[PDB]
Amino acid sequence: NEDFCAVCINGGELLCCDRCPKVYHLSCHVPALLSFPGGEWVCTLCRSLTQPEMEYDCENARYGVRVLPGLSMYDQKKCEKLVLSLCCNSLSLPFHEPVSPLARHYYQIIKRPMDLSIIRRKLQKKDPAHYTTPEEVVSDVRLMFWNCAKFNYPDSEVAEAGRCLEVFFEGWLKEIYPDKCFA
Amino acid sequence: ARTKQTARKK
Ligand SMILES: [Zn+2]
Ligand SMILES: [Zn+2]
């Protein structure tokens, strides 16, 4: 098992995946976990889609929550895999949080800001703007990359990271949704 | 359920 959180690259109390070297803060895993698991635990990237080996102690699994409208159980797992894959990629750091409100030009130019913290929240059924289809998830990810390409100079580090991470994402999308075209 | 502790560090 690795020494730093797969998502935020910091230390502290870290939950180890039983199947890959990745370790996570409870709140950095997607979905965030409400407690430390007592027994076998496998992360979202390793968990089998068909036969789920364990349900998670997360917000969407609470009794009052799983009746609410939202993604199907199948689409929830697929979209969580897509979003956690984004968050664990080294290139993703500039997209974890919204751009600082001090960035005068950024917010003059980008009219529909998007970042991975918003996407994480909308995967939760209790969010007022919760996703109901995988198309909405894919649309927000693609909006995030479009904003990056719109604002940043093409030769900049962040512009390059955005373009390269988007290529990785579209590859994962075809892996996870081989039969669904999001055109 | 293994956990570890690591020293914490546009
Ligand atoms: Zn973390
Ligand atoms: Zn894993």
Give chain A as a 3 state SS string.
Answer: CCCCCCCCCCCEEEEECCCCCCEECCCCCCCCCCCCCCCCCCCCCCCCCCCCCCCCCCHHHCCCCCCCCCCCHHHHHHHHHHHHHHHHCHHHHHHCCCCCCCCHHHHHHCCCCCCHHHHHHHCCCCCCCCCCCHHHHHHHHHHHHHHHHHHCCCCCHHHHHHHHHHHHHHHHHHHHCCCCCCC
- Asked if the C-beta of A69 comes within 8 angstroms of chain B's C-beta atoms, the answer is no
- Cα torsion angle, A104, A106, A111, A112, sign: negative
A32: containing domain: 1-57
Q: Quick one: A62 and A145 in the same domain?
A: yes
**Which of A10, A43, A160 to mutate: most B Cβ within 10 Å?**
A10
Q: Quick one: A46 and A62 in the same domain?
A: no
Resolution, expressed in angstroms to one decimal: 1.7
CA distance A15 to chain B (A): 5
Q: Quick one: A51 and A66 in the same domain?
A: no
Facing A10 at nearest CB: one of B1, B3, B8? B8
The tally of CA atoms less than 13 A away on the side-chain side of residue A156 is 12
Q: How many domains does chain A have?
A: 2
Q: Quick one: A70 and A139 in the same domain?
A: yes
Partners of B2 on chain A (C-beta within 8 Å) are 1, 15-16, 18
Q: Quick one: A87 and A171 in the same domain?
A: yes
Q: Is A181 left (phi over 0), alpha (psi -120 to 50) or beta?
A: beta
Q: Quick one: A27 and A68 in the same domain?
A: no
